[PDB]
Amino acid sequence: GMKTYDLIVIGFGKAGKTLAKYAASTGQHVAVIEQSPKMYGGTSINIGCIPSKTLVHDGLEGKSFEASYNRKNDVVNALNNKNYHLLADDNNIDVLDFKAQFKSNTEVNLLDQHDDIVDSITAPHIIINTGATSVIPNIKGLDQAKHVFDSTGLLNISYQPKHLVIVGGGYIALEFASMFANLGSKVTVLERGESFMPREDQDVVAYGITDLENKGIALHTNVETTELSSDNHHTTVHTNVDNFEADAVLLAIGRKPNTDLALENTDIELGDRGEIKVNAHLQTTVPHIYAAGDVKGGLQFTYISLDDYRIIKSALYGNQSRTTDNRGSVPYTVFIDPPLSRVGLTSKEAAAQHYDYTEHQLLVSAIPRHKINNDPRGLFKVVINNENNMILGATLYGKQSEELINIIKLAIDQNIPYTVLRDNIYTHPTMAESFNDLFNFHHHHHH
Amino acid sequence: GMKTYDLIVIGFGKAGKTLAKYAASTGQHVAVIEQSPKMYGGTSINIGCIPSKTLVHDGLEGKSFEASYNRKNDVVNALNNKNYHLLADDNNIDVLDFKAQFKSNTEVNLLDQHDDIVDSITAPHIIINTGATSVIPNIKGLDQAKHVFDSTGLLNISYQPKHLVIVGGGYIALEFASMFANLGSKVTVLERGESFMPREDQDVVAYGITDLENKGIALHTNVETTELSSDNHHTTVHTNVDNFEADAVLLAIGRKPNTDLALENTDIELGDRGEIKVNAHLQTTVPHIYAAGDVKGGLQFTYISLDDYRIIKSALYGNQSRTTDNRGSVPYTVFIDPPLSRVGLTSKEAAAQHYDYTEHQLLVSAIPRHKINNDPRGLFKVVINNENNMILGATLYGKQSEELINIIKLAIDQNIPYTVLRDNIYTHPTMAESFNDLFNFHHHHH
Ligand SMILES: Cc1cc2nc3c(=O)[nH]c(=O)nc-3n(C[C@H](O)[C@H](O)[C@H](O)COP(=O)(O)OP(=O)(O)OC[C@H]3O[C@@H](n4cnc5c(N)ncnc54)[C@H](O)[C@@H]3O)c2cc1C
Ligand SMILES: Cc1cc2nc3c(=O)[nH]c(=O)nc-3n(C[C@H](O)[C@H](O)[C@H](O)COP(=O)(O)OP(=O)(O)OC[C@H]3O[C@@H](n4cnc5c(N)ncnc54)[C@H](O)[C@@H]3O)c2cc1C
Ligand code: NI
Ligand code: NI
């Protein structure tokens, strides 16, 4: 309460740094509290999207593990520095190097590295933007096992593992599996559930599994992990299936909201999944405090955090019309090799909801651009509503899908019927022009 | 004509093979006449888009000249064979291995390899789909010069040139320049006019020229090429600026409609640039004869020939609403490295056409995904109409632009204002999400 600001952002995350710079541009004095200098710019810059896809990219080029990890460090360092200065060099923004914890509903304590309160600050509005952290499972032996990593640890590993065992079969785990396979590591993936990528289209998943296994990746389902044991050299994952000996183990079973904020000092309520409860305007249960990004639950994407900035900007400075209920369709990409990109419904979901739908598909081996790419792998699939010819969903598994899926997102939001994408002129030779064939079909009516 | 078909297609081009397969699917008996088995599937498959970009793609990966040319041969052979059988195996299509020339308005002579007439055929509708060919300049010494190629010859060359001299500086010429530089050849480009890519945005072109020159490519403007002379091993390109010693010369100064069809036997008229004259439905001056693709003039793109199939299909089988006047916005890509993609107007054109416009730009080095790509080169630039916030044009020079430009094409056609692209959720980390910044700007009224 000692030092007053117009706005406080807790965490140097995506929504937070974007909102802080906007507020400063209006003349408001902003405090951005960030607990680690290694996290300037947030998770995407330092321990997530950017380093991981740098390694994905360079591995597809056949670059070595060493060369790829070295260039990843240069990329992260450069973008960390440039993100830091974008905020800190602004006269209306103070980047405060402390761990934040609430003193009350109106006052935020600033803690040094020894967990001591050094100062306190206040502002009429407070934005919680503290992200998520890797879930640590309760597994016998984990607390003293060597050679065990979360995603952050693995992105900073000091050696190439000859054999990586991944505990977890979700999208991030599978990204790391393809990433390390393409860098020359043997990879084993252990999924507790009955299948990989449930909720994705099962025709597409079958090709994706084939393509993973053709890289020499071993995939296991129904795996119950009971214990970790380790040497100076190896770590064994003991399971109901088998004992898997590894040179490194990745724990990738989920990410939980980071709410270590002394919330007991506030009226801020948490939900059933540990997330900060927010309304459609991202207001917490304390009206002048908002929460943005992974910490408020739901989807964990950098662009959802960016959209949260749009919502909070709309609430605080705009016409309040933007909410979590009018984001538009949310696309995403699973960065296996090639990438699996998705927006909207699968044909299974369209049928379950009793849509009168038509599905159509196109193997990437039937797309002439695949010859130029020297890559025949993949499957493109679309689902359309016969009642109005609008697109209900698409799954693009294949090269360039992380770019192309944005065309289909735009079409869904703007009610562009599938016949327009069928008949359009596209550049050539490209992956985009495959839409002339992907959308070349007539109704198959379902009663 | 001795034998009668429901439809005759002259040339195994893009519009033609697409229309043949559609017509056959309605039960019609189709003849497709093609003069060369090296051209099943047309120019794109055999001597144009597909082989050139195969070499572009593999050269960006650092593959050797020999490895890239060998795989190019594999790609062309596979797709040529696939295209041939897609038509020939069809019960309702005959692929006829002859050179076509008109006998009259209603029947087509079939010529053997010695230009002798073998037979003739007729059909109530005839589609001319014969494409274009490289323009041959009048340069002293060309008749007897060794080591000189057009685009087809260069794509089938049997050795790696140590020094390729390109006579011509248009888009296809520049694609070959970057293609051979990336395979390790030295390249010199000779442009007769005062600048390269004069129709493109000049800020972008300046970056494009720097990036070509950083590859070691020499670029010359105001070049008059006066003579070619040759050794058993080298060819001298004689020029007003200097003589250039090379071991291969590419002549790339344009492509003219291929109308070698004995049109004097018909009422089909040609326009002032040698093109077959067509109306908006692609009808020639003989109403039952249509022309599609490069041969009827205008833009030479594979996707224009594909859209010509759509127009002729609408004319002969549909509601005839489809014309050359409602194609929508036509994007294109100059496949230098990185690709320069464009749709709609430049700033210069917008100012000339009296718009109240705003331009905005974004360097690729300001796009965080460029770090993942390991490539900081490029410039994205957009032009919007301040009257209605619609997009007038865009120039995307940088990686993935040949895919991204299609997003902007769709927005222009569907009247999606630039603010929707500014505010949209994009996947991450991608080149597409740069649109959040590229379109983040306000009016500057003119
Ligand atoms: C391996 C991996 C790969 C991913 N790949 C993708 C991808 O391809 N695409 C995609 O869209 N998303 C991807 N994500 C997810 C994406 O990175 C996150 O969803 C997004 O970055 C979350 O941003 P945020 O704004 O919620 O906060 P964050 O960017 O996580 O920032 C929160 C900040 O708050 C700080 N902080 C926390 N508590 C305190 C405190 N008490 N005091 C002070 N500071 C504090 C943290 O140090 C951190 O810097 C990936 C994630 C991981 C782990
Ligand atoms: C090097 C190069 C690169 C290119 N790159 C691109 C690119 O990236 N993107 C793009 O969109 N476009 C590109 N193009 C242009 C594109 O290839 C053409 O615009 C398009 O392929 C022309 O198609 P078409 O339908 O007009 O006929 P074509 O595909 O040219 O087919 C005409 C056919 O008619 C046959 N024929 C001619 N006369 C007769 C006759 N008398 N009897 C029988 N058969 C006959 C020919 O043998 C040929 O098979 C490129 C062109 C070149 C040369
Ligand atoms: Ni119907
Ligand atoms: Ni204005």
Contact B111/B100 with Cβ under 8 angstroms? Answer: yes
SS3 label, residue A79: helix
d(CA A314, CA A330): 19
How many angstroms separate the CA of residue A401 from the nearest CA in chain B?
10
Nearest residue to A359 via CA among A377, A380, A338: A380
d(CA B23, CA B41): 17
Contact B292/B282 with Cβ under 8 angstroms? Answer: yes
Strand ranges for A45-196 from DSSP E:
93-97, 99-102, 107-111, 117-122, 125-128, 132-134, 148-149, 163-167, 186-190
Contact B107/B115 with Cβ under 8 angstroms? Answer: no
Gyration radius of chain B's alpha carbons: 23
Nearest residue to B84 via CA among B72, B73, B97, B95: B95
CA of B150 to the centre of ligand 2 (A): 14
Q: Sign of torsion, CA A76 A81 A87 A93?
A: positive
For B276, which DSSP code?
B
The pocket around ligand 1, CB under 6 angstroms, is made up of A 10-15, 33-36, 39, 42-44, 48-49, 52, 99-100, 129-131, 151, 172, 258, 260-261, 293-294, 300-303, 305, 335; B 428
Contact A289/A9 with Cβ under 8 angstroms? Answer: no
Measured by CA distance, the residue closest to atom 7 of ligand 2 is B49
A441 in contact with B, Cβ within 8 Å: no
SS3 content of chain A, % helix, strand, coil (to 5): 35, 25, 40
Residue type, B237: V
Beta partners for B399? none
Q: What is the H or E stretch that residue A225 is in?
A: strand A225-230
Cβ burial of B193 (10 Å; 0-12, 13-18, 19+) is: exposed
Strand ranges for B22-71 from DSSP E:
30-34
Let me know if B445 is a catalytic residue: no
Long-range contacts of A270-273 (CB under 8 A, 24+ apart): A271/A297, A273/A297
d(CA B93, CA A363): 26
For B364, which DSSP code?
G
Torsion of CA A425, A431, A437, A439, to 10 degrees: -80
d(CA A175, CA A332): 13
Structure tokens at B69: 């040319």
Which residues are CB-neighbours of B194 under 8 A, at least 6 positions away? Answer: B221, B222
Beta partners for A164? A187, A248
Measured by CA distance, the residue closest to atom 1 of ligand 1 is A48
SS3 label, residue B157: coil
CA of B420 to the centre of ligand 4 (A): 17
How many angstroms separate the CA of residue A7 from the nearest CA in chain B?
23
Nearest residue to B85 via CA among B48, B41, B36, B28: B41
Nearest residue to A228 via CA among A237, A240, A219: A237
Contact B308/B128 with Cβ under 8 angstroms? Answer: no
Residues A402, B341: C-beta atoms closer than 8 Å: no
d(CA B325, CA B281): 9
Q: Sign of torsion, CA B145 B165 B181 B38?
A: negative
A373 in contact with B, Cβ within 8 Å: yes
Task: Tell me the CA distances in angstroms from B407 to A411, A422, B174, B306, B415, one per residue in order.
Answer: 10, 14, 25, 19, 12
* Chain length of chain B: 446
Of A341, A421, A425, the CB nearest to B327: A425
Q: Sign of torsion, CA B341 B343 B346 B349?
A: positive
Strand ranges for A262-416 from DSSP E:
289-291, 332-334, 340-344, 357-363, 379-385, 391-397
Contact A367/A305 with Cβ under 8 angstroms? Answer: no
Which residues are CB-neighbours of B156 under 8 A, at least 6 positions away? Answer: none
Q: Give the rounded distance of the alpha carbon of A194 from its chain centre.
A: 23
Gyration radius of chain A's alpha carbons: 24
Which residues are CB-neighbours of B340 under 8 A, at least 6 positions away? Answer: B197, B200, B204, B208, B333, B334, B395, B396, B397, B401
For A283, which DSSP code?
B
d(CA A95, CA A24): 12
Structure tokens at B275: 């093109």
A270 in contact with B, Cβ within 8 Å: no
Q: Mutate one of B403, B414, B420, B436 to test the A interface: name it (highest A CB count within 10 A).
A: B403
Interface of A with B in 57-76 (CB under 8 A): 57-58, 61, 71, 75
A101 in contact with B, Cβ within 8 Å: no
Residue type, B440: N
Tell how many helices (H) and how many strands (E) occur in chain A: 13, 24
Residues B425, A79: C-beta atoms closer than 8 Å: no
Q: How many CA atoms lie within 13 A of B260 on its CB side?
A: 10
d(CA A137, CA A409): 36
- Is residue B130 in contact with ligand 2, taking CB distance under 6 Å? yes
Residues A303, B426: C-beta atoms closer than 8 Å: yes
d(CA B337, CA A72): 24
d(CA B196, CA B205): 8
Q: What is the resolution of this structure in A?
A: 1.6
Q: What angle is formed at CA B317 by the lines to CA B312 and CA B323, rounded to 5 degrees? A: 35
Tell me the residues surrounding ligand 4 (ion) with CB < 5 Å: B 443
> In this structure, what are the phi and psi dihedrals at residue B37, rounded to the nearest 5 degrees?
-70, -15
d(CA B196, CA B180): 18
Contact B339/B402 with Cβ under 8 angstroms? Answer: yes
Contact A55/A72 with Cβ under 8 angstroms? Answer: yes
d(CA B74, CA B66): 13
Nearest residue to B247 via CA among B134, B144, B146, B168: B146
- Is residue B49 in contact with ligand 2, taking CB distance under 6 Å? yes
Q: How many CA atoms lie within 13 A of A253 on its CB side?
A: 17
d(CA A176, CA A197): 15
Contact B12/B36 with Cβ under 8 angstroms? Answer: no
Structure tokens at B118: 């073998």
Structure tokens at A192: 């507790």
Which of B39, B43, B50 is the best mutation target for the ligand 2 pocket, counting ligand atoms within 8 Å of the beta carbon and taking the most?
Answer: B43
